[PDB]
Amino acid sequence: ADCGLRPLFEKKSLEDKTERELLESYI
Amino acid sequence: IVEGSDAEIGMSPWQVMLFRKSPQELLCGASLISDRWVLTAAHCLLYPPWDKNFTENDLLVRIGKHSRTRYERNIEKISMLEKIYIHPRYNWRENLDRDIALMKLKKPVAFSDYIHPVCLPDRETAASLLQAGYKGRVTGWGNLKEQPSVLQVVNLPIVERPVCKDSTRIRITDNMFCAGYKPDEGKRGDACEGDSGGPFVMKSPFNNRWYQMGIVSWGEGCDRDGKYGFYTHVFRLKKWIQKVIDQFG
Amino acid sequence: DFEEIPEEY
Ligand SMILES: CC(=O)N[C@H](CC1CCCCC1)C(=O)N1CCC[C@H]1C(=O)NCc1cccc(Cl)c1
Ligand code: NA
Ligand code: NA
């Protein structure tokens, strides 16, 4: 519902230091 | 976690620590999937070859944590178990098939910056993301090789099923997948003892939410070349998850 | 190795 959205990251539009590595693999 | 790094604060707010009451100690990892339900591996609670059988009262759940040893006043929350459910066809005898268990909490935990549930996949997210080469993230407070000061994190790519099979003598099922780098790849890393029961998560590029696709289940050694970690395939057992939560509210 | 938890829990 509200699941999977982290208060200190997605809910603030901040990215953690290595999540882009995951994105870049979704090829 | 082997060859991982220090988590950032709030980077995994669904992470749960399974803690032994007496003597007080880390038992396993786990994950928060709503305000009263925790997801983990069946073998963390029931594994007769090690004379492992825990009951509700042997245990507590610690949520919101970051430090392994410290009691994080004003940050962590600790919860008591109302009822453990283990998959009726969990195969501890041969290969840990269907290695999954739910834990219902006595009282709801309160959400916070450090406490928040992860999502469980629908068939379309599963189909889109469970592909060889796609990376997921595993987190936990287990050994650094074959114990950390704080939660550790490592990103690892899902491995083609023929390579999973060929890496082991164990009989692999459709209720499992494996993840990790090949020797040929340079990069390494893996789950290890004490990481069991923790989440393998992926961030959907479709809606930007984190989904739990796997549960840390087994491996031979930790971070050995040519071997891979094995994960319970959460989407494949969701009917049972749903079922359990429905009836037991 | 574990800071002991409050007696409460
Ligand atoms: C090789 C070995 O003995 N180790 C076993 C593999 C095996 C256990 C018997 C059933 C089929 C799987 C194992 O990994 N176990 C035996 C029960 C606990 C679990 C574990 O250590 N999990 C931790 C772990 C370590 C490395 C990678 C992952 Cl994904 C998880
Ligand atoms: Na094989
Ligand atoms: Na390996």
Side-chain angles (χ1 to χ4, degrees), chain A, chain B residues 1-35 37-56 58-69 71-82 84-146 148-183 185-238 240-249, chain C residues 1-3 5-6 9:
Chain A
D2 195 21
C3 65
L5 296 171
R6 312 167 281 176
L8 251 24
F9 289 97
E10 288 77 24
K11 313 253 48 257
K12 289 176 117 150
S13 201
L14 298 172
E15 287 179 10
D16 69 53
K17 275 138 144 46
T18 61
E19 58 176 89
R20 192 62 62 107
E21 182 190 357
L22 307 186
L23 212 217
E24 280 158 9
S25 81
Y26 303 157
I27 240 118
Chain B
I1 302 291
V2 182
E3 277 297 276
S5 101
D6 283 20
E8 301 172 55
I9 305 314
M11 178 195 240
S12 198
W14 37 80
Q15 181 73 38
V16 173
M17 177 191 286
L18 250 135
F19 188 75
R20 196 202 197 126
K21 240 130 125 154
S22 184
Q24 280 210 103
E25 64 186 12
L26 164 85
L27 282 174
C28 258
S31 65
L32 185 73
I33 53 156
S34 67
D35 63 10
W37 285 98
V38 174
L39 188 61
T40 194
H43 80 262
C44 283
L45 307 164
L46 178 62
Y47 193 64
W50 286 355
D51 281 305
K52 202 217 247 108
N53 198 172
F54 289 103
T55 163
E56 282 82 3
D58 302 318
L59 310 164
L60 315 161
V61 151
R62 312 177 56 182
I63 319 160
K65 280 195 58 60
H66 183 63
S67 180
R68 181 177 63 85
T69 57
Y71 166 76
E72 301 171 284
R73 207 168 35 97
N74 286 24
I75 294 176
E76 63 173 284
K77 300 305 189 226
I78 310 202
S79 283
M80 284 170 4
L81 281 326
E82 178 170 327
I84 286 169
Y85 302 84
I86 290 179
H87 199 108
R89 294 184 74 197
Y90 160 52
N91 198 334
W92 51 269
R93 280 191 190 260
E94 187 206 341
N95 58 4
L96 260 39
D97 200 20
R98 304 177 195 96
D99 191 9
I100 188 168
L102 289 154
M103 300 180 287
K104 166 158 236 226
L105 308 189
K106 245 184 225 198
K107 291 171 208 207
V109 60
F111 297 166
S112 85
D113 287 338
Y114 314 101
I115 303 190
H116 199 91
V118 65
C119 309
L120 295 196
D122 46 65
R123 161 175 320 272
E124 302 60 66
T125 304
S128 182
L129 299 174
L130 275 185
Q131 303 209 315
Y134 288 26
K135 294 163 177 195
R137 178 177 280 178
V138 42
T139 38
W141 295 280
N143 304 339
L144 302 162
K145 29 189 159 251
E146 280 200 74
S149 177
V150 304
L151 197 62
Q152 301 290 298
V153 296
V154 74
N155 298 338
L156 305 167
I158 287 161
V159 173
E160 301 89 345
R161 186 157 304 262
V163 175
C164 296
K165 283 192 179 148
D166 283 352
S167 81
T168 176
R169 297 171 76 162
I170 301 299
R171 182 179 65 89
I172 302 316
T173 68
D174 286 353
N175 301 313
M176 330 168 171
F177 66 87
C178 86
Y181 295 98
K182 318 203 181 149
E185 246 147 20
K187 335 167 95 157
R188 49 193 317 110
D190 190 7
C192 199
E193 226 213 337
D195 285 330
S196 285
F200 174 101
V201 296
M202 295 177 85
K203 186 171 166 160
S204 176
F206 305 97
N207 59 188
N208 302 302
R209 297 181 183 243
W210 289 90
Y211 284 91
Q212 175 161 6
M213 316 300 296
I215 304 161
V216 181
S217 175
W218 61 275
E220 326 144 286
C222 308
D223 204 26
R224 291 171 188 198
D225 264 37
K227 300 202 163 287
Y228 298 94
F230 283 83
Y231 300 83
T232 311
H233 188 322
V234 171
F235 176 67
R236 199 128 195 309
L237 309 163
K238 219 204 179 189
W240 177 83
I241 293 148
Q242 234 17 66
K243 282 215 168 238
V244 166
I245 274 148
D246 282 350
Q247 144 79 16
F248 305 105
Chain C
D1 163 82
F2 274 101
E3 180 171 9
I5 61 112
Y9 311 112

